[PDB]
Design a protein around this ligand. Sequence first.
Ligand SMILES: *[C@@H]1O[C@H](CO[C@@H]2O[C@@H](C)[C@@H](O)[C@@H](O)[C@@H]2O)[C@@H](O)[C@H](O)[C@H]1NC(C)=O
Ligand code: NAG
Length: 495
Amino acid sequence: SLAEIRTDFNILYSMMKKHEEFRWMRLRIRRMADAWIQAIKSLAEKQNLEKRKRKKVLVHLGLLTGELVQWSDLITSLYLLGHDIRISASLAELKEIMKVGDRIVELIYIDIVGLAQFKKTLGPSWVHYQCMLRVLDSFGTEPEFNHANYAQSKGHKTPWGKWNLNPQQFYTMFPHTPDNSFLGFVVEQHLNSSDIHHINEIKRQNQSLVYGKVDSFWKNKKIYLDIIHTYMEVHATVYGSSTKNIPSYVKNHGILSGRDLQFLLRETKLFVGLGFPYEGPAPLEAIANGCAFLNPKFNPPKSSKNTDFFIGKPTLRELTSQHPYAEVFIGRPHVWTVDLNNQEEVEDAVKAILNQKIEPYMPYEFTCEGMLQRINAFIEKQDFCHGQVMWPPLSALQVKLAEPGQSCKQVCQESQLICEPSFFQHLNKDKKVTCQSSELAKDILVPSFDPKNKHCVFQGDLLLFSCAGAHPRHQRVCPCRDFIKGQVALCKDCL
Ligand SMILES: *[C@@H]1O[C@H](CO[C@@H]2O[C@@H](C)[C@@H](O)[C@@H](O)[C@@H]2O)[C@@H](O)[C@H](O)[C@H]1NC(C)=O
Ligand SMILES: *[C@@H]1O[C@H](CO)[C@@H](O)[C@H](O)[C@H]1NC(C)=O
């Protein structure tokens, strides 16, 4: 009934042998297995992992009836932590795994596809298991969209969301929506021992490498690159089917293996964002190998509102730059977020970059070990099956008052904290805000204070608490917590 840190992928490998569909994940796991095992050992030496209940866990990949990376890293983490995993990837496997006053599973990891299938399967008993769902939703689901009646009342047209879960049951690829939990993935290193001793030998050159494998992504960026070029060589890894948009002076390497790319990143001073693709791993991989990242700034920020790429998403989350995580959670000196319309700002950033030495940096949360700490913490401390939650600890709460036009998400972030939605239920009374009157409302923007009238508005619907949302007129009362540098998902007391 207690859980045992596994270090032998044999049992796993036979589990993942049972479908061709799993081959790509098998290969990923096999490749990283040494890193994965050093990780679980290393964690078990800095953390007592000896006192944990073995949990029976469904995982259902509707996807199989980016993602597969996260699935790989999740499934692997569940194994190394010693839990009893039932992988399903078909209606029949799911239907079999399911069909006294007990529960047949304690955790369920699933994607949006699988959730429709899970619901259709369990029918009425849905409710007996919904507190256990952990929904892999890369782009996230904001409370305004999760909550069906309210979405309808706001006239939202997207068929997505409307599941009425606790929004912390949504698991995202990057920490962009603090209404949801951050699961993430591991940024792979393709370097063995001989490469490590060789990684040293590589002398870094005053040369740039452009981010983008496709000629399309380069379109109308000549002015931007010409500024880079002024000061350093410009290398690419572009699939050269067409080169219509590639300046003549670009030194193309073509598509490289992960191994070869990492060696190239080691002789590169600057990795250059073109503005697409949005929040991918490549810039983390660059920063890890000691490159700086030139991060195009978005004015206005891009969202489901103004960008065809995001239309229909059940979230109004905005991108302030091509890589908001790199912008907010790494920043200078490693990351230089700059407006491409501001030619002077770009030139300055490039001049500044060329005159600083910066050490490599991989955030703890995007390693095998950080991921294991992070998932272990969610499994051991995050329970929705016993009503209102007590983790993270209330000791972590630090209230801020967002000014009109500012979300709780922003006010916490701008003060180097993260909005913690589980603290919202404790902001129910005024005990620099004193009310002369209060009312109840079912709105994502409350609790709110009107400092003109000294009128407070409290949340009347537990499912409408939102880190997301700004009041045009009023101040929002906001629950923030501290977080660990490199491990945003946790606070210091979160232990
Ligand atoms: C890389 O550049 C370092 C600093 O560069 C300086 O500023 C740029 C804008 C130019 O003015 C450049 O000539 C200056 O040195 C140098 O200290 C260093 O030698 C260079 N390293 C390599 C690998 O070439
Ligand atoms: C590292 O990988 C390369 C590339 O295939 C291989 O030839 C080399 O022998 C490896 N070195 C070690 C120490 O595993």
